[PDB]
Design a protein around this ligand. Sequence first.
Ligand SMILES: NC(=O)c1ccc[n+]([C@@H]2O[C@H](COP(=O)([O-])OP(=O)(O)OC[C@H]3O[C@@H](n4cnc5c(N)ncnc54)[C@H](O)[C@@H]3O)[C@@H](O)[C@H]2O)c1
Ligand SMILES: NC(=O)c1ccc[n+]([C@@H]2O[C@H](COP(=O)([O-])OP(=O)(O)OC[C@H]3O[C@@H](n4cnc5c(N)ncnc54)[C@H](O)[C@@H]3O)[C@@H](O)[C@H]2O)c1
Lengths: 299, 301, 312, 300
Amino acid sequence: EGVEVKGPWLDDAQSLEEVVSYYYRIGFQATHLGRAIEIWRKVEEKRERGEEIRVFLGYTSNIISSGLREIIAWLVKEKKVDVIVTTAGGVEEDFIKSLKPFILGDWDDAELRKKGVNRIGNIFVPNDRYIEFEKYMIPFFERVLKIEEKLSRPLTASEFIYEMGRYMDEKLGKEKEKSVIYWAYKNNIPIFCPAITDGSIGDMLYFFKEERRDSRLIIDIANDIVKLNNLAITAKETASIILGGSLPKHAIINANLFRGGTDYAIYISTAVPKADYVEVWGDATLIFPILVWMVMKAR
Amino acid sequence: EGVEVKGPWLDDAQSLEEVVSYYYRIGFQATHLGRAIEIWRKVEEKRERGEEIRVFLGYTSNIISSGLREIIAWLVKEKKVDVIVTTAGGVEEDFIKSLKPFILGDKGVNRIGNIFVPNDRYIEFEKYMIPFFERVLKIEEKLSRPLTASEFIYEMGRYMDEKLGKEKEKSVIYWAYKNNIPIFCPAITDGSIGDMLYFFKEERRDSRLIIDIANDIVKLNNLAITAKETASIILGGSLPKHAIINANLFRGGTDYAIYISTAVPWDGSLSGAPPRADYVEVWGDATLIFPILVWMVMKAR
Amino acid sequence: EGVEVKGPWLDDAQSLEEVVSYYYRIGFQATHLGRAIEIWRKVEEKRERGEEIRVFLGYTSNIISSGLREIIAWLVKEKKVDVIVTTAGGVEEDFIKSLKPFILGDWAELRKKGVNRIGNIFVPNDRYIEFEKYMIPFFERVLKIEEKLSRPLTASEFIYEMGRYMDEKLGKEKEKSVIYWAYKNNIPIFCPAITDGSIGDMLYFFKEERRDSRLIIDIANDIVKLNNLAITAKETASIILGGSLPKHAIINANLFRGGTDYAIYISTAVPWDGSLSGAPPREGVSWADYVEVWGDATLIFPILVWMVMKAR
Amino acid sequence: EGVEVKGPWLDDAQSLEEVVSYYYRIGFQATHLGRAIEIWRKVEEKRERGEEIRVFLGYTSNIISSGLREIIAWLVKEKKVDVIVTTAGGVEEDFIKSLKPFILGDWEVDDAELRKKGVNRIGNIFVPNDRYIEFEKYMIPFFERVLKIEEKLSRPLTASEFIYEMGRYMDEKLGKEKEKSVIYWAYKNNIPIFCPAITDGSIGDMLYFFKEERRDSRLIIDIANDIVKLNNLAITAKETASIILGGSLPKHAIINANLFRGGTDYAIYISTAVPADYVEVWGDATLIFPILVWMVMKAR
Ligand SMILES: NC(=O)c1ccc[n+]([C@@H]2O[C@H](COP(=O)([O-])OP(=O)(O)OC[C@H]3O[C@@H](n4cnc5c(N)ncnc54)[C@H](O)[C@@H]3O)[C@@H](O)[C@H]2O)c1
Ligand SMILES: NC(=O)c1ccc[n+]([C@@H]2O[C@H](COP(=O)([O-])OP(=O)(O)OC[C@H]3O[C@@H](n4cnc5c(N)ncnc54)[C@H](O)[C@@H]3O)[C@@H](O)[C@H]2O)c1
């Protein structure tokens, strides 16, 4: 006799946490979210007992476009993860949100182009967000170039993003305290982004280089692979928490290839594709807040 | 809308419900679940002031295969919905679960995703269905007319009441019979009930046990027409989503709609058709979405 | 070793059929379509040599809404399938298309204009008004037949009589109709929820205006009918477009014989097991002629049918 | 009120091409594929009559894993596209396939047995381990050549120059099999291949061993100067067309490069991700793309 499939009886359940504790028994994806909760509960309890599991967190730009950005930022502030891989949008949107917020719209594209509003699903980014971002990135580019001139070597993408967090601390106010990039800098959590020029930052850098005839500002990706892979190899155990697919999933999986794979994995994805590995199929905005709370906060 | 996109800061949030209270301003599907909570809350307060809103609840068999069955039954027990349309699996698996439970999976075992239904579940179901068929035929001879599918399912709850003990009180069919909530299922013979009916008819050379579907369209369509307002809560696609939407065309459309499904429209399908500030679709597995939605509507404050 | 993954070289490929003959070694869903072509070619050749394989064809309403309607009708005309299971829309829209065509639109004020939208397909309201002029006399014939026999028709008998009605009342248009050719060629069409659509809508009006409770459509006796068709066959094959009731009914019927002997499933629904998984078309079977092709049938099915039936 | 929804009648239709010529009026995704055929025929016919339309081709690694690799290579050989954006897998699997083919993973093998045998599984496609050993045989000397070029120029190569040099290297060291390679024909036809995350894959894995064992930090792959090259190719064009298979970095990069000019002038997207010179065909590109290319480029 195996585990009985049963949902919560709502006359007896006393909290939403209690409802969610039944998810491992509900079946389908609820069962997967239930398994994810208690895979991460091990890793977190094991970490708090001084056991070394290096936690790799990967996400695509939609994660940062959404309100999950604040949950990611908290995870980094509280040192719940050790290594981040994301996309160009995952970096720049975290910075931009520290300047002006994104706005909830509705999933009239011709009107949006006329009004200069960038739409991400049902989330709107007005044009002045990118102008404000340029005001900060152009001086950041000059600083990166001077650092490279002083070092006589290019910065890697992760060093670039590390320097971004240092730059955020110097130039921004209280808004930086909900920033992933800021807390990664403060807690020395590297952020890898092998395609950091594929977005607004790259567009900024295009104008900087076109205006100033610069070819000396270099972003290297060859030396980050050593840094990322070594972080997986030198760990006694690794865990993978990957939201979405694309470059971050592939990079984290590929990095853990060398040590024979990650030792624990939680995948959350809408892309149709032991007890220590699970994928939850669904939108991370629905799933991730419940997962984090049940692992980090639930009593 | 125009609200700033923002997630909860977990240094401040006190409970999971407060976390979920941010969903409307999180973006993507979280925003859709946030709007679904607002919609059903609005309908549920209006019902509690005595405002007539006829709630049509539709779901496919996978909902009943999952632990959501207990949540559906509670919603039926507490009269949160007025009309049910489901599929054959949605009916017969609710009965079967009141005899033996489904087993969580990764020898004659029926697998539904990661859910196991061992063969003795259906063997036990037949021990109840064969006498029930005899009762249905005896009813139809007494009435000199066939039972419609909803009448057949109502009679199935009465039979559950007489023949079963405690475990019927987690059952959707039982509570629908107890509360006189009609369950429509115009393809009731599509699964296990059909299989044993097949055995029943071969065994007794019977062609007199008739299940009519022509008269339930009057019953279901009139339930949509006669109400002042209707609300449509639909899990999945297929026959139930189509029947509830089709029934509500006779009144010009439902007044509130919450659809939860994993299907998409680009195959052109009903299951993927969109819900048309009182209409919303949440894309995802209902076993993840529905318990959050019901709790925040029926028990959050 | 094994089959080398390889696409056609377009300096050498002479025809689209030659391009498609590479699909089995292209990988992903293209490999599955290649396997589906091989499976149905096998079934069709065995049938043409006199071996008995009862072919079950299932499809959802969308198949008939789309231009696949003409391809299904040709399959039924040529008796490439023996049994059909569909939904209410799959029946009624085939009849309607014999009266007035569906119109190509785009994927929302159509409601005041009285235009029903199915994806990027438009059905103007006069299609249903015209359909009603035919259904009301048909309902009256159905009632007379049921009074004559003192028994109700099943859905399959109802649909068979619909085809006889089309033969009597229509001209050349019926020659593109699934319902006409199924009646004409003695191919049963099962539809266990035939009231869930426009037929049921007009039956509601017919029942309301006449205060009728006597027009009965039975579903309990077709399951004997449908299940015996699967049991008595020496072999069966299941070609199923989409999900819902038709997929479940054909698989459920074939449970009684230990599962179908050949299966080709085409659906946009992502099975739990995987889009590339073996298991999806292997369900309900108890024993390598099983394949699922993931995608829109309007893309896949015309290629499959041509390569199986017409490519030389 | 418009076009009548109608499929082909198989008593009349004489060819598969004739069957596919009904796709525009079949509805759903068939209609989108018919529209994609019309759009690309328009682009191609304009190009054949001298009109400047810069064609950006984007695809993810699954495209090159599959048999579509031969079709992409033909498009590049015949100069049907002007700019390529792909991923690391899209680059390195094209090179590997010129060494040893990929194998159809037709049977059911559990991944534990696959890993014992050293077989990498990509969907239903198998890459046996000796493919990567043979790849390393060629990539280590290529790394050494790249470093010498960098020392010679006193500057790093960008990713697109790296891939261009990969094509030159293929032409020097490989035989007839290179004639079915995207990288080779892009080099011969001076078609740039952009890949802003070229180290996230097998090339990156071998560079790791190269750098780790040689304590090298001098071999650089720059991406800052490629965004200039790519964006200029879109801004300097009179008109642009985008043909994008799948999502990920290539789709984002091509859309981003066309942002400055108000977007591409024609777009054909083919993807499985759930979202009149612009169309998306929802489905597997291995099903759709061979039909689209034949009907655009060869159906007469
Ligand atoms: N036009 C209409 O959709 C229409 C009209 C009248 C009646 N109805 C009624 O709607 C009810 C429910 O719809 P249904 O059962 O016909 O199917 P459905 O619309 O519920 O679709 C079921 C599944 O079929 C698959 N599918 C749909 N289109 C596909 C395609 N082009 N290619 C591949 N797979 C595809 C998908 O997995 C989908 O989830 C039925 O009772 C039917 O009679 C529908
Ligand atoms: N569970 C079983 O194995 C079983 C048993 C007996 C009978 N049946 C019969 O199976 C037939 C066909 O199945 P059906 O009509 O119940 O549904 P279906 O298989 O037609 O599913 C239709 C749609 O439901 C949606 N869906 C499925 N699971 C979902 C989930 N967890 N959350 C959200 N959306 C979800 C999908 O988008 C899908 O396209 C019915 O006639 C039923 O009686 C099923």
